[PDB]
């Protein structure tokens, strides 16, 4: 099982073509990198924007729509027969602040008068509607899958108390889905996307929320499991229990941002790829082996498995890879060991089945086989 160039290795999407599509998250600049273009053409049949389709990238100022970057990803996908997932219509992260300012330019979260709070809610929902409308009216014939809302359940099992929720209550979620369905029609598929979907109390809160919304006729077709996981956690048994319970509600499941970190939480990362011991890649390959065997076992309930990146030279996990140093200046990776300082976001994670030099990893062989 050689570390051969991925560029000519057996195609990952083809291995799984009857089980679910295989996707990658990208930045438009990658569509200008020969290696990345050949990787997308060779191994993937589904794509998503790491960042350029988020709210702040699309409408940074009210009335100013920037579709130029998103368009590049849509054109490439269409020219290569790839499905597209839209990430994401609504999120509390880096949301353009203008959405949440009242007519006088003051934060709506601050309004204490009940009648002005009601007016802000209505103004906010109107803005939400127009953002969704403009985007879905442009892409309804091109993008099949949609993360309508992202991370709306808090890790405490209560609804995340973002400005969307403080200002508009639960209706912002119902409004977002109804608007996507109204302007995109019945053929686009609508998802509620979140991370740590396997973890209690968040899992049961998500389940109850979607069950309720569907009972009320809110159009929700599936759940997106970001799946930012570790080599050990969460267990395959809990992933399975999660996929199954949402599937029992009549919902499709898509793995939307998979990455298998080499670290725990908080991560104590190595400073370079070179420093990661070979054994960690073997541990990761066994995790990937078990994980995809499970996705295959549940393939009639999962329509897509998308990795949050292409190869290990580029992954958002690096922004979380903190490097701890002892007083002698040696790197510390044991979570319980002494350390003197930490360099936040300066280390290197290695989450995919393709290495930084675009050669296949042991995890690739573990999932391209049939054992
Ligand atoms: Cl990134
Ligand atoms: Cl390497
Ligand atoms: Zn293909
Ligand atoms: Zn190096
Ligand atoms: Zn290297
Ligand atoms: Zn295998
Ligand atoms: Zn499937
Ligand atoms: Zn990136
Ligand atoms: Zn290599």
From Swiss-Prot:
What Pfam families does the annotation carry? Glyco_hydro_10
Limits of the GH10 domain: 6-370
- What Gene Ontology molecular function terms does this protein carry? endo-1,4-beta-xylanase activity
This protein's pathway: Glycan degradation; xylan degradation
The question of whether Hydrolase is a record keyword is answered with: yes
Q: What does the similarity note say? A: Belongs to the glycosyl hydrolase 10 (cellulase F) family.
Q: Which InterPro entries match?
A: GH10 (IPR044846), GH10_AS (IPR031158), GH10_dom (IPR001000), Glycoside_hydrolase_SF (IPR017853)
Q: Per its record, how is this protein called by name?
A: Endo-1,4-beta-xylanase
Places the protein is found: Secreted
What induces or represses expression of this protein, per its UniProt record?
By xylose.
Catalytic activity from the UniProt record:
Endohydrolysis of (1->4)-beta-D-xylosidic linkages in xylans
Q: Name one GO cellular component term.
A: extracellular region
- Per its UniProt record, what PROSITE patterns does this chain match? GH10_1 (PS00591), GH10_2 (PS51760)
One GO biological process from the UniProt record? xylan catabolic process
Which of UniProt's keywords are assigned here? Carbohydrate metabolism, Glycosidase, Hydrolase, Polysaccharide degradation, Secreted, Signal, Xylan degradation
Question: Catalytic residues?
Answer: 151, 257
Q: What EC number(s) is this enzyme filed under? A: 3.2.1.8
Q: Which domain of life is it from?
A: Bacteria
Keyword Hydrolase in annotation: yes
């Amino acid at each position: 099982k050689p570390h051969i160039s991925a560029l000519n290795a057996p195609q990952l999407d083809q291995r799984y073509k009857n089980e679910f599509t295989i996707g990658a998250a990208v930045e438009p600049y990658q569509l200008q990198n020969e290696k990345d273009v050949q990787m997308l053409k060779r191994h993937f049949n589904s794509i998503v924007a790491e960042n350029v389709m988020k709210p702040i990238s699309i409408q940074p100022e009210e009335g100013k729509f920037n579709f130029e970057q998103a368009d590049r990803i849509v054109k490439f996908a269409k020219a290569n027969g790839m499905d597209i997932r839209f990430h994401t219509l609504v999120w509390h992260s880096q949301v353009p602040q203008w959405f949440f300012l009242d007519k006088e330019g003051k934060p709506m979260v601050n309004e204490t008068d009940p009648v002005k709070r009601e007016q802000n809610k209505q103004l906010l929902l109107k803005r939400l509607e127009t953002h969704i409308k403009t985007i879905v009216e442009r892409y309804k014939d091109d993008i099949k899958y949609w993360d309508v809302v992202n991370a709306v359940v808090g890790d405490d099992g209560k609804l995340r108390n973002s400005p969307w929720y403080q200002i508009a209550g639960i209706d912002y979620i119902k409004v977002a889905f109804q608007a996507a369905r109204k302007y995109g029609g019945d053929n686009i598929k609508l998802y509620m996307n979140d991370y740590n979907t396997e973890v209690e109390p968040k899992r049961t809160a998500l389940y109850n929320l979607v069950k309720q919304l569907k009972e009320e006729g809110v159009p929700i077709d599936g759940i997106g499991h970001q799946s930012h996981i570790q080599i050990g956690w969460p267990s395959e048994a809990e992933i399975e229990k999660t996929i199954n319970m949402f599937a029992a509600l009549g919902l499709d499941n898509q793995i939307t941002a998979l990455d298998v970190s080499m670290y725990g939480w908080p991560p104590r990362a190595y400073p370079t790829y070179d420093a990661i011991p070979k054994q960690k890649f073997l541990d990761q390959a066994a995790r990937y082996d078990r994980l995809f065997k499970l996705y295959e076992k549940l393939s009639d309930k999962i329509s897509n498995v998308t990795f949050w990146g292409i190869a290990d030279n580029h992954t958002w996990l690096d922004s979380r890879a903190d490097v701890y140093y002892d007083a002698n200046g040696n790197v510390v990776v044991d979570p319980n060991a002494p350390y003197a300082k930490v360099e936040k976001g300066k280390g290197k994670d290695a989450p995919f089945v393709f290495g930084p030099d675009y050669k296949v990893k042991p995890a690739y062989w573990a999932i391209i086989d049939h054992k």
